Design an enzyme around this catalytic site. Structure first.
Site, PDB file in Angstrom:
ATOM      1  N   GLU B 200      16.253 -10.884  -9.666  1.00 56.07           N
ATOM      2  CA  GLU B 200      15.084 -11.464 -10.334  1.00 56.07           C
ATOM      3  C   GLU B 200      13.797 -11.085  -9.591  1.00 56.07           C
ATOM      4  OE1 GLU B 200      15.252 -15.783 -11.163  1.00 56.07           O
ATOM      5  OE2 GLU B 200      13.170 -15.680 -11.873  1.00 56.07           O
TER       6      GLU B 200
HETATM    7  N1  LIG Z   1       2.985 -21.179 -22.511  1.00 54.03           N
HETATM    8  C1  LIG Z   1       3.248 -20.881 -21.215  1.00 54.03           C
HETATM    9  N2  LIG Z   1       2.634 -19.835 -20.607  1.00 54.03           N
HETATM   10  C2  LIG Z   1       2.879 -19.515 -19.315  1.00 54.03           C
HETATM   11  N3  LIG Z   1       3.749 -20.199 -18.537  1.00 54.03           N
HETATM   12  C3  LIG Z   1       4.440 -21.272 -19.018  1.00 54.03           C
HETATM   13  C4  LIG Z   1       4.219 -21.684 -20.419  1.00 54.03           C
HETATM   14  N4  LIG Z   1       5.006 -22.756 -20.631  1.00 54.03           N
HETATM   15  C5  LIG Z   1       5.672 -23.005 -19.475  1.00 54.03           C
HETATM   16  N5  LIG Z   1       5.328 -22.131 -18.505  1.00 54.03           N
HETATM   17  C6  LIG Z   1       5.834 -22.077 -17.102  1.00 54.03           C
HETATM   18  O1  LIG Z   1       6.836 -21.068 -16.979  1.00 54.03           O
HETATM   19  C7  LIG Z   1       7.837 -21.471 -16.041  1.00 54.03           C
HETATM   20  C8  LIG Z   1       9.215 -21.151 -16.607  1.00 54.03           C
HETATM   21  O2  LIG Z   1      10.051 -20.641 -15.569  1.00 54.03           O
HETATM   22  P1  LIG Z   1      11.608 -20.286 -15.801  1.00 54.03           P
HETATM   23  O3  LIG Z   1      11.676 -18.788 -15.975  1.00 54.03           O
HETATM   24  O4  LIG Z   1      12.138 -21.159 -16.918  1.00 54.03           O
HETATM   25  N6  LIG Z   1      12.456 -20.748 -14.339  1.00 54.03           N
HETATM   26  P2  LIG Z   1      13.525 -19.710 -13.416  1.00 54.03           P
HETATM   27  O5  LIG Z   1      14.874 -19.871 -14.076  1.00 54.03           O
HETATM   28  O6  LIG Z   1      12.965 -18.310 -13.500  1.00 54.03           O
HETATM   29  O7  LIG Z   1      13.444 -20.296 -12.027  1.00 54.03           O
HETATM   30  C9  LIG Z   1       7.652 -22.963 -15.773  1.00 54.03           C
HETATM   31  O8  LIG Z   1       7.424 -23.162 -14.370  1.00 54.03           O
HETATM   32  C10 LIG Z   1       6.433 -23.382 -16.587  1.00 54.03           C
HETATM   33  O9  LIG Z   1       5.468 -24.084 -15.786  1.00 54.03           O
HETATM   34 MG   LIG Z   2      12.502 -16.839 -15.460  1.00 54.42          MG
END
Ligand SMILES: Nc1ncnc2c1ncn2[C@@H]1O[C@H](COP(=O)(O)NP(=O)(O)O)[C@@H](O)[C@H]1O
Ligand SMILES: [Mg+2]
Ligand SMILES: Nc1ncnc2c1ncn2[C@@H]1O[C@H](COP(=O)(O)NP(=O)(O)O)[C@@H](O)[C@H]1O
Ligand SMILES: [Mg+2]
Lengths: 153, 591, 591
Positions: B200
């Protein structure tokens, strides 16, 4: 005339050796092999791929390849393998597992029967995917594990 | 006169001969399904393919551009957890469950997975149909659409055979799309698979250096020495990505490392082809360090410490003065009346994945004492039921004290440098790193660093916007610490329009929302991270906080993350990509 | 009970995992457009493709089966000759023509070529639509249809740049098919190109040995010795193909050859891949030796000899007693009233290609004295106009004498062993063979021989049917000579139903038609061919006369000729075929 490829691989002895010292010694060892006595005529040579510290699981995987090669279980030829209607090559006889106990460590190696579904935590090794055996050889998902402090000494 | 007529016919034959010899460019769509912790979303990319006579077909790496990031649908964890609730029985987290018996429910797991996959397909098709012309559509539908669904930290710590069994079903669902739309989607076990934390981070590094034009094989981005070794023109930049459930720390070595520290060579570990410049990169990912996961763990650990919990009131130094919320790790919503409503839903609780992992019925805890002790250090009792695990014992209300220095020292002891490693971090421990502090104490590099993450950027931006931090800000820890110390000591006053954060010494004000209320915890994380980065033997040339990287046109061609990296990881191996994507293609799925 | 339910779910995952790992077979259509001398026809073939993970896609050579041979449309010569009639002006054969000026008529050449190509496309689609099910149709339309249009002896001797300029236009026409039918046809300069006489023969050899299971790389058809050299299990068989305008003599060496004789090694000349058994093959083609071309030349030469032409009546020993036709090489039609009507149409005359080549306005005659003398030996005057060239001077009626021995001695001196080589045979002369007699005098092999050609087979069959030749017939020249001597001495009697050939000594009878009237000329050709074959140092193990070779099912999978050979020539080079047919494919033509 052909030259002598040299493969110096350290096992459990310096597997747990602290700091940079072990990997620094290996760079020097390769230079020593690559510069032999010109008097004897035997052209010895090595590289970082052949002369390197092998992992406990790697040590076990090679012990598995050795066992199945000599026992004529592993092979690409129609005498040791078979190709089905779906072009997949299978070994004629079952691939045998190994349990090797040395001076400092013990290895437990066995192939999984037709991809036995394993938990997320258990990380098995595919011989072709992890480039241990070429694509032409029959595929096998092997569990290779080594335990320090299990060897005789 | 007549000679010019002869030349028209000669050109007619020459132009036709050119087509037979020249390389023809076609447009192909590439799909990356981000199966994250918070949600499962689709990412639709466009790329220019080049077909040359006797040379084959290959993607131009610099032509890769993101069209749109799709809707945030149900995460793979929720999908598997509902399947367990419906087939293994409700509250399976507090009871011992026989995994062998759950094999009779595989078609039932497939029907549940079909629900999500039909939504993602519908969304992917919607992006394609609305953002492509008829000529482009023909090209896209003819070449086929390679799909790459990779799960991250959401199901990384998932128990038993379930996660890997779901992936086999997911691939079958992708390989069998709706014939009505015409878009030929296809996948394989190499493209659609659970990616490791290190993977990742490595793909995030490839994405960063590709878009910033640091990585490349052409003479414009690379140079060959007298000894045939190709070196990159400019220094390869490192990345720090803090997502939903995990944080990634990635940097190239510019260095002799101990035997315990296991670095990754891009060419040797087949991440980049032999033609690309060589680099030994340290890639590490920490579970329980993402925005959602760290929030639950911090509240659990802080509100268990007698230094903060007194008479049922937990004093939170990372929360503003005047702000108060119910004592639970549940989803916080900042209502227009100034109140903070905490969601009671067990799944919509930030401790749920940690409490589900930290269970005595999970073979990773019952057999492994090391992991059991890791859970107990974070106050989680694996013997007690799920409800009791997420519960903050003898606590009713969380009160904000607004002390930034106290907030730093806590994030430090809890998330950055704890006694034992944070649960489900065997992947980080295997590479030689128990915690975030250990990363720079064992491995250091002068390579420039880049900070990525919505809240990570928001932390620096908020201070820049309120004129507390300079617009031209380097990795100066003292500047950041003082600016945040002033901002975090702000009082929350419920105004006529809604909750407003009021800065001291009449500096300024902004509206309090469900995203900025706990921004000071993320600010403390940045401080302690830059502190350990400064403590290292080798310090990065510069530390940059960027949302996106601008391309040649000026508009950023793609977003930062593992998406572009995973595309490049497969597309750059010309011979291997050509066989799987074009020789086999969607035609491999013909029954 | 419950364990069996667990096993159903375990099998569900195992079956799904098999699909991800196993090789999937798809059906692909292959098109060979035979651009012969007499006509241009389409040949539609079906083959089984195999796509394996990380191994790519490849055609099973033994799965190649012919669906149907299409309608016999206009030959490429007629197409080019009409273009010259309409743009360079009528009777261009008797006048000097400036080739430079004809470049302003390339779009006009394209519009004329479009006429024929639309008919061939319509016919190809008709074969596919009527002989494929909906499931097969999807597979065929998705993979794309590789097209191989190869011109043979019809335009081999064609003058100036015209022929090669037409081929560039033909490829563009194939690469742009009707989008309505859905069949994705595509080509390239490697597949669609004019094939040499030696190439025509080499592909005919590959076809013969492939279908007869003599050629192969598998242990069933080949063996590897102690020195790693692969040898074929059974002896590779040679072929003798007599078409419309040329005759091919092909045989493998089983031999030390002179410096002048230039043999072809299959692996070295990239005809067969390295994995296939090695063979040094002698491949030679003779112009003016095909059924149509030899007919015109024989009548011209025989009816110019004072030993046969007397008082305007040419005595033909190759024609039956009682049979008479007008003195011209025009298309002979045997009318139901017993009469033989000779077509007056200049294009529907069997001497036309020879008289068009043998022109003082053709740079191959005006600059090359050797070629001018070759034409004059065959009574053709290149200085005289086209009408005078095809004209049999001082001759009105051709009378059949039915003398077989005299017919043999004439075919011998005219077609088999002439003073100078037959016109437009520089390709044969370069390999070291001026005539058919020279082939076996310089190169001989014990390799079994196969005889191919509609009239070549008919010659042996007619004698077998009338019980003149044994059913178990070898290459016994004396048996064939005596049987044909009796059959060719037959009298033609115009009966109540129509013209009937009556065998001597009341042996039998058959109806006289436009195909069998001059079968005795072809019979004489066989005799003299077997005579020279017997004269050689090494004689073939056996000589076989076969129409088609039966496959494993019993039904012949494909017809004999260069068609299967040209498919195998491209499909067997796995890496090269995969790139051009699947990586590039029809998607290369996307504009
Ligand atoms: N609309 C949006 N634009 C950008 N970022 C956004 C969003 N909605 C949630 N997020 C953010 O993306 C992140 C999602 O991360 P993930 O990829 O779900 N977590 P991991 O499995 O890679 O560790 C959250 O921390 C959230 O705060
Ligand atoms: Mg992710
Ligand atoms: N329906 C038919 N079936 C089989 N053979 C047929 C046919 N109609 C014509 N023919 C025969 O094919 C031959 C066509 O040969 P071509 O391929 O036109 N001549 P070349 O350029 O290869 O030298 C003619 O000799 C003709 O007698
Ligand atoms: Mg032909």
């Amino acid at each position: 005339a052909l030259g002598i490829p040299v493969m110096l691989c350290s096992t459990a002895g310096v597997r747990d050796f602290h700091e940079w010292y072990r990997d620094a010694l290996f760079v020097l060892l390769r230079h020593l092999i690559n510069n032999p006595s010109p008097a004897h005529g035997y052209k010895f040579f090595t590289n970082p791929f052949w002369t390197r510290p092998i992992t406990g699981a790697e040590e076990g995987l090679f012990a598995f390849i050795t066992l199945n090669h000599l026992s004529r279980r592993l092979g690409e030829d129609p005498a040791r393998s078979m190709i089905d209607e779906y072009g997949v090559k299978h070994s004629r006889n079952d691939l045998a597992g190994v349990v090797e106990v040395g001076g400092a460590s013990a290895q437990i190696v066995f192939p999984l029967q037709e991809g036995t579904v394993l938990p997320s935590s258990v990380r098995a090794v595919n011989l072709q995917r992890e480039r241990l055996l070429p694509e032409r050889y029959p595929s096998a998902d092997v569990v290779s594990v080594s335990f320090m402090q299990l060897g005789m000494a | 006169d007549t000679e010019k007529r002869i030349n028209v016919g000669k050109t007619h034959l020459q132009t036709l001969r050119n087509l037979e010899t020249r390389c023809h460019d076609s447009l192909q769509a590439l799909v990356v399904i981000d199966a994250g912790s918070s949600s499962t979303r689709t990412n639709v990319f466009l790329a220019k393919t080049r077909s040359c006579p006797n040379k084959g077909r290959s993607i131009d790496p610099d032509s890769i551009q993101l069209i749109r990031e799709g809707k945030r649908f149900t995460g793979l964890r929720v999908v598997l957890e509902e399947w367990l609730d419906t087939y293994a029985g409700k509250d399976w987290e507090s009871r011992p469950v026989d995994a062998r018996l759950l094999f009779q429910y595989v078609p039932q797991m497939h029907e549940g997975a079909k629900k999500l996959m039909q939504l993602l397909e519908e969304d992917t098709v919607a992006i394609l149909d609305s953002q492509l012309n008829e000529e482009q559509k023909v090209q896209v539908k003819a070449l086929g659409i390679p799909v790459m669904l990779c799960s991250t930290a959401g199901v990384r710590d998932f128990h038993e055979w379930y996660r890997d069994a779901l992936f086999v079903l997911l691939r079958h669902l992708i390989n069998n799309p709706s014939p009505a739309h015409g878009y030929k989607f296809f996948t394989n076990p190499f493209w659609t698979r659970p990616i490791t934390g290190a993977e990742e981070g490595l793909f995030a590094f490839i994405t960063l250096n590709h878009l910033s034009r640091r990585l490349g094989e052409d003479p414009a981005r690379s140079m060959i020495d007298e000894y045939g070794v190709k070196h990159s023109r400019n220094d390869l930049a490192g990345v720090v990505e803090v997502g939903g459930a995990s944080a990634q720390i990635v940097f190239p070595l510019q260095t002799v490392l101990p035997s315990s520290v296991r670095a990754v060579n891009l060419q040797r570990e087949r991440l980049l082809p032999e033609r690309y410049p060589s680099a030994d990169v340290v890639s590490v990912s920490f579970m329980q360090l993402g925005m959602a996961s760290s929030a639950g763990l911090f509240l659990k650990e802080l509100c268990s410490n007698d230094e903060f919990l007194q008479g049922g009131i937990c004093s939170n130094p990372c929360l503003f003065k005047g702000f108060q919320q119910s004592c639970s790790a549940g989803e916080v919503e900042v209502r227009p009346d100034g109140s903070a409503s905490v969601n009671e839903d067990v799944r919509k609780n930030r401790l749920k994945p940690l409490a589900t992992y930290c269970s005595v019925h999970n073979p990773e805890i019952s057999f492994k004492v090391t992991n059991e002790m890791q859970c107990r250090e974070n106050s989680i009792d694996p013997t007690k039921p799920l409800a009791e695990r997420m519960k903050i014992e003898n606590c009713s209300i969380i009160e904000g004290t607004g002390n930034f220095d106290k907030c730093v020292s806590q994030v430090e002891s809890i998330l950055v440098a704890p006694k034992l490693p944070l649960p489900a971090n065997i992947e980080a421990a295997s590479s030689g790193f128990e915690s975030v502090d250990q990363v720079f104490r064992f491995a250091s590099s002068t390579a420039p660093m880049f900070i990525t993450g919505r809240e990570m950027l928001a932390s620096i931006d908020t201070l820049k916007d309120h004129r507390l931090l300079r617009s031209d800000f380097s990795g100066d820890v003292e500047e950041l610490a003082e600016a945040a110390r002033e901002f975090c000591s702000s009082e929350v006053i419920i105004r006529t329009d809604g909750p407003v954060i009021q800065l001291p010494n009449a500096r300024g004000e902004q509206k309090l929302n469900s995203l900025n209320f706990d921004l000071c915890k993320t600010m403390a994380l940045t401080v302690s991270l830059l502190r350990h980065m400064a403590a290292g033997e080798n310090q990065p040339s510069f530390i940059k906080w960027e949302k996106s990287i601008a391309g040649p046109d000026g508009k950023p061609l793609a977003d930062l993350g593992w998406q572009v990296g995973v595309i490049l990881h497969h597309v750059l191996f010309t011979e291997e990509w050509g066989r799987t994507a074009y020789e086999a293609g969607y035609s491999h799925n013909l029954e």
